[PDB]
Amino acid sequence: NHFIIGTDMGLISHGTRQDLRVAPKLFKPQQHGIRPVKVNVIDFSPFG
């Protein structure tokens, strides 16, 4: 039910399906400005 979505603007958002207010935060490195790095591959570590 949880998922993340990346955009060309250099940010990745978090969300889910059932409860849409659990943690509506975004992911960002320790950077400033924008840095539209145009994220193109997302994966998940297959572990606990």
Binding site: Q18, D19, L20
Partner: protein, 371 residues
């Protein structure tokens, strides 16, 4: 550490300056009072040759004298004197005397004299203080063959009743009926025209209020938030029946008992404050909310997102009307209900659509339609 101790000595002990020896465990509570922007109070009490400060206020004492510090500003300004940002007020640890003296001596004459001409609600606040201190003052100042019969008869009934907490909700639903009958019967013209009004109403008031406290405790032990709602619903409904049934029989039977069996001065009038009535409604609202939720649950595939999310949204709302509720801050709950109705609505809208399709699909069969 200057004003706090100085005032403590001035009120409790020697009217002088305490030696600069802040070597007590109570110094932490003092430092918290000063520095913590949240701690707007600090209690002090004189112990056995000792001084005890604590942010927590407790009223276990019988008739002791205490003093409480009150802060003006969010945080203490240490550079300024510790008496230019703090108020003090003494009070007795007596649930009757303290309120009587405090209100009568301080608040009533203060409002009467110290009033701004441009401020409203003053005459109402004045009336409230007068009625309040009056009631406290009243409490603060507080053939034997027939007398023995009465004592023995009603004492037996009272003691049989007093073992109320030992009964479940499913049983007291019937006790309310038995108790009202037997008590109204014994008051009848048996050995005397009429027993003095004192117990005539007092015993019934105790019995009614006792049912209130009984149901309040027993409904709390149902855990009206947990998963086993099946058993809760059964016991909850009993709690409501107890509350409503007692009020109904009291209001009806009183009208005839005082005319037919005991020549009591009151005729065609009731006595009972009906505090059970509010308690019963409280449970009815809970039952309706839980019932509606269960009905939505049957349609969980229709409103999955709403049902799951709203459950936890509404939990802090329910927390505004806890178990063992007393309607002394009822407006807070009213706000909670207003939001409930406005936030649950998406659930109703989606289900309304489903129901329209499911019912209108019925090919005008009166049988299926009704069901």
């Amino acid at each position: 550490k200057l004003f706090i101790f100085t005032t403590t000595q001035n009120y409790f002990g020697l009217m002088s300056e305490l030696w600069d020896q802040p070597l007590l465990c109570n110094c932490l509570e003092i430092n918290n009072f000063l520095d913590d922007g949240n701690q707007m109070l600090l209690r002090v009490q004189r112990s056995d040759a000792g001084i005890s400060f604590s942010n927590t206020i407790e009223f276990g004492d019988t008739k002791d004298k205490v003093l409480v510090f009150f802060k003006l500003r969010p945080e203490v300004i240490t550079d300024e004197n510790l008496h230019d940002n703090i108020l003090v007020s003494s009070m007795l640890e007596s649930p009757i005397s303290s309120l009587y003296q405090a209100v009568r001596q301080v608040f009533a004459p203060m409002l009467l004299k110290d009033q701004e001409w441009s401020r409203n609600f003053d005459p109402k606040l004045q009336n409230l203080l007068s009625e309040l201190e009056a009631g406290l003052g009243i409490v603060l100042r507080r053939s034997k063959e027939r007398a023995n019969y009465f004592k023995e008869l009603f004492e037996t009934i009272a003691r049989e009743f007093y073992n109320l907490d030992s009964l479940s909700l499913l049983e007291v639903v019937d006790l309310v009926e038995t108790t009202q009958d037997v008590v109204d019967d014994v008051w009848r013209q048996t050995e005397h025209d009429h027993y003095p009004e004192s117990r005539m109403l007092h015993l019934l008031d105790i019995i009614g209020g006792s049912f209130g406290r009984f149901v309040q405790k027993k409904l709390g032990t149902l855990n009206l938030w947990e998963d086993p709602y099946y058993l809760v619903k059964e016991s909850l409904k009993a709690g409501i029946s107890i509350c409503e049934q007692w009020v109904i029989v009291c209001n009806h039977l009183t009208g005839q008992v005082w005319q037919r069996y005991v020549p009591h001065p009151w005729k065609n009038e009731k006595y009972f404050p009906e505090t059970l009535d509010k308690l019963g409604k409280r449970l009815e609202e809970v039952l309706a909310i839980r019932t509606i939720h269960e009905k939505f649950l049957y349609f969980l595939p229709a409103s999955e997102e709403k049902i799951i999310c709203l459950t936890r949204v509404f939990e802090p709302f329910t927390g505004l009307n806890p178990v063992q509720y007393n309607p002394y801050t009822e407006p807070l709950w009213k706000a909670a209900v207003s939001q409930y109705e406005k936030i649950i609505a998406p659930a109703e809208q989606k289900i309304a659509g489903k129901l329209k399709n499911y019912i209108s699909e019925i090919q005008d069969s009166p049988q299926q339609l009704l069901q």
